[PDB]
Symmetry: C6
C-alpha cells in the first residue's frame, strides 16, 4: 500500500500542489533568507483507495501518513528540509487523496519598486511511475498583503518550469 499507485491508463501521476502562506518573518541581517510558515496541500489519485460511498456508507476516508503512499516533496532553496506536521489526509470515493501539512522553513531567496522571491519545489522520482508536479491555484494563497516588516506582497502564484517538473512559487513584493 506504500508503493506508488499503479498507473491509470491515460493519466500520469499528477500531484497538484498549493501553498497557503500564514506568515513570513525573521528576514536575516543580510536579507538573504527569511522564515515561512504555511500550509502545503498535495492532491493525487490512488485507485487502490477508491471506495463505494453508498455501500460503505461514507463520503470521505481519513488515513495516517504511514498507511499510504505519499509523494516526497523537497523544497530546493531552503536552509534545512522543512519542518512539517501533517494536518489532514483524506480520500474521496474516486481515490483522490487530499493531503494537508503545516510547515516551517527558512527560504533562501535574497532580496535584491518590486521584486520576486522564489520557493522551488521538486518531487522524488519513483520507477513505476512518472510523477509530475502541477499547481492548483485554488489552493495557493496568502493570509495578507504584508510580506514582512517593510514590504508588501503584490502577488503569490506558482509556475511550472523545466516526465517531471519543478514548481516555482513566486512571491512578488515591493517596498512600503
Amino acid at each position: 500500500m506504500v508503493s506508488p499507485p499503479p498507473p491509470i491508463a491515460d493519466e500520469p501521476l499528477t500531484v497538484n500542489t498549493g501553498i497557503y502562506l500564514i506568515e513570513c518573518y525573521s528576514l536575516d541581517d543580510k536579507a538573504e533568507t527569511f522564515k515561512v510558515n504555511a500550509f502545503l496541500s498535495l492532491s493525487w489519485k490512488d485507485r487502490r483507495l477508491a471506495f463505494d460511498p453508498v455501500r460503505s456508507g461514507v463520503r470521505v476516508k481519513t488515513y495516517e501518513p504511514e498507511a499510504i503512499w505519499i509523494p516526497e516533496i523537497r523544497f530546493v532553496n531552503v536552509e534545512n528540509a522543512r519542518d512539517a506536521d501533517v494536518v489532514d489526509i483524506s480520500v474521496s470515493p474516486d481515490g483522490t487523496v487530499q493531503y494537508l501539512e503545516r510547515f516551517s522553513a527558512r527560504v533562501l531567496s535574497p532580496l535584491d519598486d518590486s521584486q520576486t522571491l522564489h520557493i522551488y519545489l521538486i518531487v522524488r522520482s519513483v520507477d513505476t511511475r512518472n510523477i509530475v508536479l502541477a499547481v492548483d491555484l485554488e489552493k495557493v494563497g496568502k493570509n495578507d498583503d504584508v510580506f514582512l516588516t517593510g514590504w508588501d506582497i503584490e502577488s503569490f502564484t506558482a509556475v511550472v518550469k523545466p516526465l517531471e517538473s519543478k514548481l516555482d512559487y513566486q512571491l512578488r513584493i515591493s517596498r512600503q
Copy 2:
C-alpha cells in the same frame, strides 16, 4: 479504545478548549514573534469511558494519554509545533474527559501602526477523523491570564476566543494589548 468516540446519535464531537496564559515573553527584535507559556484545556464526551461511581469505587478516573483517544490540536501560527507536557486527564462518571496540558510555543503574530492598541492571535485547529465530525468550541471559564501585563512595554486589555472559518473552522484566541 484509541479510535474516536462513537456518537450518542448524529451529534458532532464538540471539543471545548481553553487557554490560560501563564507568561508571555521574549518578543523578538522585529516584534514579529513572542513566546507563550500557558495551559491548554480540552473537554469532550467519550461514552465508552462512562462509569458508575458507586460500582467503581472512584468518582473521577485518571488516564494516561496513550490509553485513550485525545483530539489532536494544532496551533496554526507558531514557529514549531508547541512543546507540551500533559498535566491531567480525568474522566467523569458520564464520560466527560477533561484534559490539561502546559505548553510552550513561539507565536507568530507581528505587532503593528498609528494606533496604541492591537489584537494578537493564536489560531487553533483540530485534525479531522472520518467516523466523527469534530467541532471546536470555547469554554470561557477555562480562558484567562495570570495578569494584566503582556510583556515589557504592553498591557493586556483582554484575552478571549472566537470561532472563524478555515482560510482556504478554527478557534481564534485574541489577545488585545496596548502600550503602557
Copy 3:
C-alpha cells in the same frame, strides 16, 4: 510503580523543598533567568516499609524506575526542568526521601526596588489517591544572599494551597515558591 495505597483514608502528602544553588543568566528583558537547585520530595509508601532490626539496614536505596514517584511539573518554566536524580532513600516506616538536582529557565519577570519572583509547582493527578503538596521548610533554602548580579535575596519561602489557583483540575495541588529580592 502504581501510587501507594492508603495507611487508611489519609491523602498522599508530598513534602517538597527547594534548595537554591545558583540563579544566573537574567535575559536582556529581565523576563527570565536560570536556576540551579535541589528539589526534595518526601512521602510515605507503606509497601516499602521494612524491619531494620531483622534486615540489618536502616535505609534502603532505590532507583527511580523501581518505585512510584510523584510527577512534579514546574508551571512557569521555559521547558520541563532538566533533572538528575541524586538520592532516593526509604526509611523503615516507608517514608521515601527523593533528591534531584535540576536546572530550569524560570519565567518570572522583574518589574520596584523590592520584588517577589515565583516558581510554581504542581503535581500530576492519580485516580487511586488524592495527592497533596506540602512544604518542608527545613529543606527550603539558598546557598547565599545574592540573587544574581545587581540583586540581593531577602528571603526564599513557599506558600501552600495558593489562591493563585488557575484551574480546578491542576488542583491536584499547587505550591508557590517565592523569592523576594531587592536592588543592591
Copy 4:
C-alpha cells in the same frame, strides 16, 4: 552493496558535478559561508545493467540502501554536509546517476578585489577497486552571478587530479571546485 566489479581492468570513474543553488551567511570574519547545492555523481555498476526492451523500462529507480554508492567527503567544511537524496536512477548499461541536495558551511576564507574560494572533495577508498573522481562539466553550474551580498561570481569550475594533494592515501582521489569571485 559492495563496490561494482570491473567491466575488465578499468578504474571506477565517478563523475561529479555541483550545481550551486545559494551561498549565504558569510560569518563576521569572512572565514566561512553556507552553501546550498546539488551534488551529482555518476558511475557504472554492471550488476545493475538491464534490457530495457524486454523489461519495458528505460530507467530504474533505487533507494540508497539498496545499492553501492561512493562515499564522498567534503574536506574543508565545518561538519559533514547535510544531504538529502533526491534521485538515484540507473540506465540500461548500468550507469548510475545519483542526485543529492546538500547544505554545508564551507571553510574557505576571503582574504584581493578578485579571489578564488575552494570546495575540496575526496572519496573513500575500497580495496576491490581503484576509485577515481572526475568532473562532468555539464553538471557543474550555478543559479546566478551573485556569490552573496557584496560579491559577484566570475566562474565556478572544478579541477581534477589537483596537486594540492595533502596525503598519498586520501589519494583515492581529490577534486577542487573553484569559485572565483570579485567585489561588486
Copy 5:
C-alpha cells in the same frame, strides 16, 4: 559485577578524587559562570577485581566502564551534567581501581585582591555501602598560574565538607 563492591571489614567505600585543571575559559558577560576543561581521577577498592600478578603474569588490568562498578559523581554547581570521556580505567593486584576521565563543564561560581571560586562534588548513594568522598592531593593540580584572561590562580585545593560528604574544590584567584 556492576553492583557496588561488597564491604571490606574495617574500611568504608572511600573514593579518592582529584581534579587536574587543563584550561579555564569563556567567563560570561556577567562573570557568573565559566567553562572548565580538566581531568577527574577517582580511586577506590573493589576486591572482586583483585588478582595475583605472579600467577596471572600481569601487574595492571584495564577495563571498560560498562564492565565494572564506577561511583556516580555529580558536580553540584554546573549548568549541565559534565561532558566526560573516559581515558583510563586500570586495576592493581589488590583491587585498587584508578579511573581517569577528561571532562568539560560550565561551572556556576560567580566572581565577586583575591577570591575563591568553587566546584562542589557529591556522589550518588547506594544501599549496600556507605560511599565516602576523599581528596587525593597528589592528583589535584593545574596546568598553570593563569585562571583566565585577567586573573591569576593563587592555589587550587579541595576540602571535605559536611556516611557521606561533599567535596569543595577551591580555586583561589586574584586580579592581574
Copy 6:
C-alpha cells in the same frame, strides 16, 4: 580481532601520528579558543592482518573501523571530543595499518603578552590497553598545513610536534604563529 595486536616480541606498540591542518578559524572574542579542521593520520603494525599480496590478489586491503582494532586517541585541550569522520583505513602486506580521519575541534589554547610571536598547542594522548604498552610517535611526513595563514591577523611560522610527559606521555603539536 578487535583486541590490540600481540607483539612480535616485547616491542611496545608504536603509533605514528600526523596532523595536516586544513583550516583554522573562528577565534573567539577572548582569543582563548579557535576551531581547527584537519586530517589525523595514525599508523601502527598489526601482524594478524599481514597477507601475501600474490596469494590474496590485492596489494592493499581496506577495512571498516568496526572490523579492526584502532588506537583510541584523545585530544586533551579541546572543548568536546573531536568530531571525526574516517576517510581511509588501509593495510599493507606486512600488517602496517594506515588510518586517516578528517576532524573538527575547538582547541583550547589561548593567545597571549609583549611579544609578537606565540606557540599554540594541541595535546594528544592514547588510551592504555593491558596487553600492550602503546607509544605515540610523530611521523613528520604526515605533519603539515595547507598554508601560511593561521587565521585572520596571524601567520603560521611552523607546525611541528614533540613528545612530552603526562602532567600528573603525550604528543604536543605546536603551532607557532605571529602577528601580520
